[PDB]
DNA sequence: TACGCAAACGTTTGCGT
DNA sequence: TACGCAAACGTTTGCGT
């Protein structure tokens, strides 16, 4: 079809092709002919042929879990608008946690040659870092690690444990001793992460928690509302909770609700991302901010460098969360004693 | 290097693209040499080589407004299994209804040569349907119109119309007659066709709304916090909310609560949506519920079709929404009297 | 039997002059 | 000056025998 046009402008392929990339100078009689034929053609000019070529196809791949969940959501937004503005094509792939979803997306992946490769699985066992690596050779970097668990990628790190032990203080700086927590998957470094940040406050106050006080979630409301009542449902009840993640939280507000208790008058929550609307929650949710927008950038940025300044060494950015008090928390009873 | 796999199996290149498709019969030895072959070289088959040939990415472009927002996000994530399951890549793209963005996307995918485009932009302009039609020529679906605006493009219908009318209806019958509505854009079908399903029912049984009682939004929670605000903050205030959308409706919530009006108690509010998580919004929210994942299945499949069956026929398939009983709404002064 | 040779897909880019 | 010829990118697929 360049063939088209070069002839319906009487000039060769060479200089359609000239014009179109100005990639070298071209009379503007000539110029304006390719345009002229270019456009009754009605051309596009094709991008696989072009990637043929040259050599990289000028998109990228996002290995996601979920992109429901408002948290991903979030952060996928942000990482589309990177590409957006700076040419590339997002490809997006939610491989649900399931290994072979995950071999299978890798490999369409490669195969499609994406430029580089952003991956956020949530959780990662050697099987899964083993695959990882057998495409070292793509640029990649993963945006939810704790530590850098490989050498073959570039990591964004999020502070996980400093946000899970902000948590915790404030709680124990507003008169809280009696503290309740929902973790999200011990598997996964905002669970995990966050839970042990809080856990090591804890321990500074001297503050014990019961057993029988923590449970675990999975991040999807329904863990938050049953985690939730499963706590209220018991004979002594801790006076605060430390919440995993919004939604989560979000969840066990409405047990609470349900159960006629009061938040923040009869229990004190609160939870971990502030999420785009968690300031809509009832109440108002008091929770630790994870700076998404950036935490997307900031990828989207290590990449294009190993990209473009064809880098090798990998390379680490931590970011890092922040308190935001809302309306959710209440000073516990010990508030006065200090 | 496909090159380079037929010669380290010392065959031809022909005998290992057969093999790797499995198109023609191959002695047992010739396959397995060449997997190993495949397998130390480390082969990665390009598709974009192969795109070049056969004449399809298997690559399908969605053309969104934004992928934050819950309701979308929910659509997405289920047009993505579906490609996923059958082979197709999603390229998404956010053109967050801005022309320009528009054209842009549009445009890359022409290039990308995306077998097929999902179109999902909430607000269609004379400017931007004939955009739309510049590509008839790729084939696609408009996933988001009440009537078929286009004979170049399938269509999925909604039927939002009948939501709203569904949702006045409930009203009426619980013993509402004060009603108010915060409508999303009126620009876009979910917002005024909404809207309009709503307005007939009430004029079906005489019920009048002064226009002081309804506050446009824009889907988004703040918009719901302000509309609400408005109009429980005046002299005469209704019994009852028509809330446009799940997430306005999340807005509207929190504000009641904030002038400690008491849902349903005080006020009673339905939505529509019914988004992923409505059930958790305290109150369990009562809404309409929209058929997302089957909106998504749908619309996939439309595209296949016309992609393989190579339709050239345009289409609209209806969907329907239904009303989902929750825990906001409470009878009114007149259901006693009926 | 079971497999190769060679042209083609639509570009970009080196040398020409 | 301002532009062309022709090879190459990595495949698939028609005919061969
Ligand atoms: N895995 C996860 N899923 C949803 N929200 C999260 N917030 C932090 N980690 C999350
Ligand atoms: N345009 C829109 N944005 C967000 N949620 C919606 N629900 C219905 N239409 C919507």
């Given at each position: 079809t360049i063939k088209d046009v070069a002839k319906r402008a009487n000039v060769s392929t060479t200089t359609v092709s000239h014009v179109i990339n100005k990639?070298?100078?071209?009379?503007?009689?000539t110029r304006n002919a390719v345009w002229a034929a270019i456009k009754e053609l009605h051309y596009s000019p094709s991008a696989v042929a072009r990637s043929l070529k040259v050599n990289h196809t000028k998109s990228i791949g996002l290995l996601a879990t979920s992109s429901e969940a408002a948290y991903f959501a979030e952060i996928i937004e942000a990482v589309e608008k990177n590409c957006f503005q700076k040419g590339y094509t997002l490809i997006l792939?939610?491989?649900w946690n399931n290994l072979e979803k995950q071999?299978?997306?890798?490999?369409?992946?490669?195969?499609?040659?994406?430029?580089?490769?952003?991956?956020?699985?949530?959780?990662?066992?050697?099987?899964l870092l083993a695959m990882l690596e057998e495409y070292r050779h793509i640029p990649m970097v993963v945006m939810d690690?704790?530590?850098?668990?490989?050498?073959?990628?570039?990591?964004?790190?999020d502070n996980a444990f400093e946000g899970g032990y902000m948590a915790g203080r404030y709680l124990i700086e507003r008169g809280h001793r009696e503290i309740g927590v929902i973790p999200g998957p011990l598997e996964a470094n905002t669970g995990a992460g966050r839970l042990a940040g809080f856990m090591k406050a804890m321990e500074e106050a001297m503050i014990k928690v019961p057993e029988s006080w923590i449970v675990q979630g999975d991040f999807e409301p329904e863990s938050g509302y049953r985690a939730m009542q499963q706590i209220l449902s018991q004979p002594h009840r801790?006076?605060?909770?430390?919440?995993?993640?919004?939604?989560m939280a979000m969840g066990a507000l409405c047990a609470?609700?349900?159960?006629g208790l009061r938040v923040p008058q009869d229990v004190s929550l609160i939870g971990?991302?502030?999420?785009?609307?968690?300031?809509?929650?009832?109440?108002?949710?008091?929770?630790?901010?994870?700076?998404?927008?950036?935490?997307?950038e900031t990828a989207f940025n290590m990449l294009l460098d190993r990209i473009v300044n064809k880098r090798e060494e990998p390379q680490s950015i931590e970011v890092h969360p922040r308190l935001i008090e809302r309306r959710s928390v209440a000073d516990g009873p010990f508030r006065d004693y200090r």
């Open positions: 990639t070298r100078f071209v009379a503007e009689e792939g939610n491989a071999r299978a997306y890798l490999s369409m992946m490669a195969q499609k040659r994406v430029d580089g490769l952003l991956v956020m699985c949530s959780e990662y066992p050697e099987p690690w704790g530590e850098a668990k490989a050498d073959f990628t570039d990591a964004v790190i801790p006076t605060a909770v430390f919440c995993g993640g919004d939604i609470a609700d349900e159960m971990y991302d502030n999420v785009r609307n968690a300031r809509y929650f009832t109440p108002a949710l008091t929770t630790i901010h994870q700076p998404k927008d950036s935490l997307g």
